DNA sequence: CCGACGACAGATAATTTGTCACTGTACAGTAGAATATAGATGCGCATCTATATAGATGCAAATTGAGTGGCCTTATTAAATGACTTCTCAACCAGTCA
């Protein structure tokens, strides 16, 4: 038996605006989990493999976000801030990137998927929807392990130089 | 002159050989045979041995069939096929017309 340890996981702190797909992706690298493994631990089954793709066709319910909150130690009201606000239409096909800000905070911000967003206001730069050199479309944000293009291996921080 | 010894010759009993008469003795059924022992050799019967096990057992892979566990897009409209549920199913009197 254990000598007086408290039950634990490699918890992670969320960044100031990352998407739920990106956060779950980091959580399941801090702990080595598969997408269906994290869904099974949370008790919500195969649901997590939709959310990592932004397949929010039926939206994340209060009861499902609370189930994830019991794993990841973030309350349901802070998990809701990683999803679009009520009636803010997102798009889940083109994954998009600022890249200039990815040097200030290495994350996929949820706001880059809003249908109303076309330029990052912190930097006044046009948002990217493909790698500026090889034209490859970005992987889903849960898979942003390297923080670079998967085809030509150019860092996302260097795509700051190639945009607008 | 007397005594002792050798040469030569002569005579003689001992020795050997032969002949002759009287005699003690074997021929008479008879010693190969009996009776111990040691020492070597051979046939028979028992008393071990050394080999030869096949059956039983323990064990260790080599699958082999039978499990169990882990991983997965979703909401509207329209047409098609196959089904379910509900509803309905008066009859003669009163006003024209050739």
Short mmCIF file of C-alpha atoms (C1' of nucleotides) in Angstrom, two decimals:
data_model
loop_
_atom_site.label_atom_id
_atom_site.label_comp_id
_atom_site.label_asym_id
_atom_site.label_seq_id
_atom_site.Cartn_x
_atom_site.Cartn_y
_atom_site.Cartn_z
CA UNK A 1 0.00 0.00 0.00
CA UNK A 2 0.99 3.71 -0.49
CA UNK A 3 2.68 5.78 2.33
CA UNK A 4 0.04 8.60 2.63
CA UNK A 5 -0.20 9.97 -0.95
CA UNK A 6 -3.31 11.76 -2.40
CA UNK A 7 -4.81 10.36 -5.67
CA UNK A 8 -3.46 12.35 -8.62
CA UNK A 9 -2.93 13.00 -12.36
CA UNK A 10 -0.61 15.22 -14.39
CA UNK A 11 -3.05 18.17 -14.21
CA UNK A 12 -2.44 21.17 -16.52
CA UNK A 13 -3.40 24.86 -16.21
CA UNK A 14 -5.47 26.19 -19.19
CA UNK A 15 -4.11 29.19 -21.17
CA UNK A 16 -6.02 32.54 -21.41
CA UNK A 17 -8.17 31.56 -24.47
CA UNK A 18 -7.32 28.08 -25.87
CA UNK A 19 -9.98 25.88 -27.54
CA UNK A 20 -11.45 22.79 -25.82
CA UNK A 21 -9.91 20.61 -28.59
CA UNK A 22 -6.43 21.98 -27.81
CA UNK A 23 -6.83 21.74 -24.03
CA UNK A 24 -8.01 18.10 -24.14
CA UNK A 25 -5.08 17.36 -26.50
CA UNK A 26 -2.58 18.76 -23.93
CA UNK A 27 -4.32 16.91 -21.07
CA UNK A 28 -3.92 13.58 -22.91
CA UNK A 29 -0.18 14.22 -23.45
CA UNK A 30 0.50 15.35 -19.86
CA UNK A 31 -1.12 12.00 -19.00
CA UNK A 32 -0.56 9.40 -21.75
CA UNK A 33 -4.20 8.79 -22.83
CA UNK A 34 -5.95 7.98 -26.11
CA UNK A 35 -9.03 10.09 -27.08
CA UNK A 36 -11.38 7.14 -26.34
CA UNK A 37 -9.33 6.43 -23.15
CA UNK A 38 -9.97 9.98 -21.83
CA UNK A 39 -13.65 9.67 -22.82
CA UNK A 40 -13.81 6.30 -20.96
CA UNK A 41 -12.11 7.74 -17.83
CA UNK A 42 -14.57 10.65 -17.84
CA UNK A 43 -17.45 8.12 -18.29
CA UNK A 44 -18.81 9.93 -21.43
CA UNK A 45 -17.56 7.23 -23.88
CA UNK A 46 -16.67 8.12 -27.51
CA UNK A 47 -17.87 11.80 -27.18
CA UNK A 48 -14.30 13.21 -26.76
CA UNK A 49 -13.28 12.10 -30.29
CA UNK A 50 -15.94 14.53 -31.69
CA UNK A 51 -14.89 17.48 -29.53
CA UNK A 52 -11.23 17.21 -30.60
CA UNK A 53 -12.49 17.59 -34.25
CA UNK A 54 -14.92 20.42 -33.30
CA UNK A 55 -17.89 18.15 -34.24
CA UNK A 56 -20.21 20.07 -31.82
CA UNK A 57 -23.35 19.18 -33.90
CA UNK A 58 -25.16 18.23 -30.68
CA UNK A 59 -23.35 20.78 -28.40
CA UNK A 60 -21.44 19.82 -25.17
CA UNK A 61 -24.14 19.55 -22.46
CA UNK A 62 -23.76 20.73 -18.84
CA UNK A 63 -23.58 17.08 -17.63
CA UNK A 64 -20.80 16.15 -20.13
CA UNK A 65 -18.64 19.20 -19.25
CA UNK A 66 -19.05 18.36 -15.53
CA UNK A 67 -17.89 14.78 -16.23
CA UNK A 68 -14.71 16.15 -17.93
CA UNK A 69 -14.31 18.68 -15.04
CA UNK A 70 -14.03 15.73 -12.58
CA UNK A 71 -11.02 14.41 -14.55
CA UNK A 72 -9.18 17.59 -15.54
CA UNK A 73 -9.76 19.61 -12.32
CA UNK A 74 -11.27 22.59 -14.23
CA UNK A 75 -14.90 23.51 -13.29
CA UNK A 76 -17.70 23.35 -15.87
CA UNK A 77 -17.90 27.20 -16.04
CA UNK A 78 -14.18 27.55 -17.03
CA UNK A 79 -14.54 24.64 -19.52
CA UNK A 80 -17.47 26.54 -21.13
CA UNK A 81 -15.10 29.53 -21.82
CA UNK A 82 -13.13 27.21 -24.20
CA UNK A 83 -16.27 26.90 -26.45
CA UNK A 84 -18.12 29.53 -28.59
CA UNK A 85 -20.56 31.77 -26.60
CA UNK A 86 -24.31 31.21 -27.20
CA UNK A 87 -25.10 31.99 -30.88
CA UNK A 88 -21.47 32.78 -31.96
CA UNK A 89 -21.26 30.57 -35.07
CA UNK A 90 -17.93 28.72 -35.43
CA UNK A 91 -16.62 26.73 -38.42
CA UNK A 92 -15.00 23.29 -37.83
CA UNK A 93 -13.45 22.63 -41.30
CA UNK A 94 -10.49 25.06 -41.84
CA UNK A 95 -8.38 25.01 -38.67
CA UNK A 96 -6.88 28.51 -38.39
CA UNK A 97 -3.81 30.12 -36.76
CA UNK A 98 -2.47 33.58 -35.79
CA UNK A 99 1.16 32.34 -35.38
CA UNK A 100 2.45 35.85 -34.42
CA UNK A 101 0.82 35.36 -30.99
CA UNK A 102 1.85 31.64 -30.80
CA UNK A 103 5.26 32.93 -29.63
CA UNK A 104 3.46 34.80 -26.74
CA UNK A 105 1.24 31.81 -25.81
CA UNK A 106 1.64 28.40 -27.53
CA UNK A 107 -2.07 27.48 -28.00
CA UNK A 108 -4.95 27.33 -30.54
CA UNK A 109 -7.31 30.15 -29.50
CA UNK A 110 -11.04 29.33 -29.84
CA UNK A 111 -11.74 32.74 -31.46
CA UNK A 112 -9.91 31.80 -34.70
CA UNK A 113 -12.81 29.44 -35.54
CA UNK A 114 -15.56 32.13 -35.25
CA UNK A 115 -17.23 33.00 -38.62
CA UNK A 116 -16.86 36.73 -37.70
CA UNK A 117 -13.02 36.69 -37.13
CA UNK A 118 -10.68 37.42 -40.09
CA UNK A 119 -7.65 39.25 -38.49
CA UNK A 120 -6.01 38.98 -35.03
CA UNK A 121 -6.57 42.35 -33.22
CA UNK A 122 -3.58 42.05 -30.83
CA UNK A 123 -1.32 42.10 -33.93
CA UNK A 124 -3.66 43.51 -36.69
CA UNK A 125 -2.67 40.55 -38.98
CA UNK A 126 -4.81 38.31 -41.30
CA UNK A 127 -5.51 34.85 -39.77
CA UNK A 128 -3.90 31.84 -41.59
CA UNK A 129 -5.86 28.76 -42.83
CA UNK A 130 -2.88 26.78 -44.34
CA UNK A 131 0.95 26.61 -43.98
CA UNK A 132 2.32 29.78 -45.68
CA UNK A 133 5.15 27.85 -47.52
CA UNK A 134 3.83 24.33 -48.49
CA UNK A 135 0.03 25.17 -48.51
CA UNK A 136 -0.81 22.18 -46.23
CA UNK A 137 -4.00 22.54 -44.07
CA UNK A 138 -3.36 22.40 -40.27
CA UNK A 139 -4.09 19.27 -38.14
CA UNK A 140 -6.95 19.44 -35.59
CA UNK A 141 -5.83 21.48 -32.50
CA UNK A 142 -5.72 18.44 -30.17
CA UNK A 143 -2.82 17.16 -32.38
CA UNK A 144 -0.62 20.35 -32.11
CA UNK A 145 2.20 18.42 -30.34
CA UNK A 146 5.19 19.97 -32.20
CA UNK A 147 3.80 23.49 -32.79
CA UNK A 148 4.97 23.43 -36.45
CA UNK A 149 3.67 22.44 -39.91
CA UNK A 150 3.44 18.60 -40.19
CA UNK A 151 4.60 18.54 -43.89
CA UNK A 152 7.46 21.07 -44.16
CA UNK A 153 8.28 21.24 -40.38
CA UNK A 154 8.21 25.09 -40.18
CA UNK A 155 7.54 26.33 -36.66
CA UNK A 156 4.17 28.13 -36.06
CA UNK A 157 6.13 31.02 -34.48
CA UNK A 158 7.96 31.60 -37.85
CA UNK A 159 4.60 31.89 -39.72
CA UNK A 160 4.38 35.28 -38.03
CA UNK A 161 6.84 36.43 -40.74
CA UNK A 162 4.98 34.98 -43.72
CA UNK A 163 1.38 36.30 -43.11
CA UNK A 164 -0.78 39.30 -44.17
"C1'" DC B 1 141.86 -131.30 5.34
"C1'" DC B 2 137.00 -130.18 6.70
"C1'" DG B 3 132.63 -127.78 6.05
"C1'" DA B 4 129.13 -125.29 3.28
"C1'" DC B 5 126.70 -124.06 -1.21
"C1'" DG B 6 125.45 -124.49 -6.35
"C1'" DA B 7 124.67 -127.62 -11.12
"C1'" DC B 8 122.93 -131.39 -12.97
"C1'" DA B 9 120.50 -135.44 -12.84
"C1'" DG B 10 117.09 -138.74 -10.67
"C1'" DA B 11 113.06 -140.31 -7.97
"C1'" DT B 12 108.54 -138.90 -5.81
"C1'" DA B 13 103.83 -137.59 -3.82
"C1'" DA B 14 100.40 -133.37 -4.51
"C1'" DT B 15 97.33 -131.76 -8.12
"C1'" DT B 16 94.28 -132.26 -11.69
"C1'" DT B 17 91.49 -135.06 -14.64
"C1'" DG B 18 89.01 -138.95 -15.72
"C1'" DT B 19 86.15 -143.20 -14.72
"C1'" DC B 20 83.01 -145.96 -11.86
"C1'" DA B 21 79.70 -147.38 -8.26
"C1'" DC B 22 76.31 -146.04 -4.70
"C1'" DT B 23 72.80 -142.47 -3.27
"C1'" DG B 24 69.49 -138.27 -1.37
"C1'" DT B 25 65.76 -136.25 -3.35
"C1'" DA B 26 61.83 -134.32 -6.31
"C1'" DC B 27 57.82 -135.92 -9.47
"C1'" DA B 28 53.72 -135.86 -6.92
"C1'" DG B 29 46.69 -129.60 -8.10
"C1'" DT B 30 48.76 -124.57 -6.55
"C1'" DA B 31 51.48 -117.92 -4.95
"C1'" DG B 32 49.45 -114.57 -8.21
"C1'" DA B 33 46.42 -112.59 -5.09
"C1'" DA B 34 43.82 -109.89 -1.31
"C1'" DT B 35 43.34 -105.33 0.92
"C1'" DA B 36 44.02 -100.99 2.22
"C1'" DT B 37 45.50 -95.96 0.92
"C1'" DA B 38 46.31 -91.32 -1.91
"C1'" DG B 39 45.70 -88.66 -6.04
"C1'" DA B 40 43.73 -87.07 -10.30
"C1'" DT B 41 39.58 -86.67 -13.38
"C1'" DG B 42 34.83 -86.26 -14.78
"C1'" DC B 43 29.46 -85.64 -14.53
"C1'" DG B 44 25.75 -83.61 -12.08
"C1'" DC B 45 23.26 -80.06 -9.42
"C1'" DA B 46 22.83 -75.98 -6.79
"C1'" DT B 47 23.94 -70.97 -6.20
"C1'" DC B 48 24.87 -67.11 -7.49
"C1'" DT B 49 25.93 -62.86 -10.87
"C1'" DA B 50 25.11 -59.28 -14.79
"C1'" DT B 51 22.28 -57.89 -18.71
"C1'" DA B 52 17.99 -56.62 -20.23
"C1'" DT B 53 14.52 -54.79 -20.05
"C1'" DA B 54 8.91 -52.56 -21.07
"C1'" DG B 55 5.75 -50.34 -18.20
"C1'" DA B 56 4.83 -46.49 -15.32
"C1'" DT B 57 5.73 -41.66 -13.96
"C1'" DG B 58 7.21 -36.95 -13.89
"C1'" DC B 59 7.93 -32.90 -16.53
"C1'" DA B 60 8.50 -29.46 -20.11
"C1'" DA B 61 7.36 -27.18 -24.46
"C1'" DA B 62 3.74 -26.65 -28.37
"C1'" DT B 63 0.26 -25.52 -29.65
"C1'" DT B 64 -5.12 -25.00 -29.34
"C1'" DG B 65 -9.48 -23.70 -28.40
"C1'" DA B 66 -11.81 -20.56 -25.62
"C1'" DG B 67 -12.30 -16.40 -23.68
"C1'" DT B 68 -11.77 -10.99 -22.38
"C1'" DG B 69 -10.40 -6.05 -23.16
"C1'" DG B 70 -9.83 -1.63 -25.97
"C1'" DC B 71 -11.14 1.66 -29.88
"C1'" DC B 72 -15.57 4.27 -32.62
"C1'" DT B 73 -19.72 12.07 -36.02
"C1'" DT B 74 -24.21 14.23 -36.05
"C1'" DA B 75 -28.45 17.33 -36.94
"C1'" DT B 76 -32.39 19.08 -40.47
"C1'" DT B 77 -35.22 18.58 -45.51
"C1'" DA B 78 -36.78 15.67 -49.51
"C1'" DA B 79 -38.09 11.01 -52.33
"C1'" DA B 80 -38.46 5.46 -52.18
"C1'" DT B 81 -39.89 0.72 -49.70
"C1'" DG B 82 -41.95 -1.73 -45.57
"C1'" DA B 83 -45.31 -0.95 -41.39
"C1'" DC B 84 -48.70 1.39 -37.34
"C1'" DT B 85 -52.71 4.80 -35.61
"C1'" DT B 86 -57.15 7.95 -36.29
"C1'" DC B 87 -61.57 9.44 -38.97
"C1'" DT B 88 -65.55 8.65 -42.26
"C1'" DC B 89 -69.03 5.25 -44.73
"C1'" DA B 90 -77.96 9.24 -43.15
"C1'" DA B 91 -82.49 8.67 -46.08
"C1'" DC B 92 -87.31 11.65 -47.87
"C1'" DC B 93 -89.01 16.02 -47.94
"C1'" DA B 94 -89.46 20.34 -50.24
"C1'" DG B 95 -89.02 23.26 -54.63
"C1'" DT B 96 -89.23 23.03 -60.35
"C1'" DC B 97 -90.48 21.04 -65.14
"C1'" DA B 98 -91.93 18.80 -69.83
#
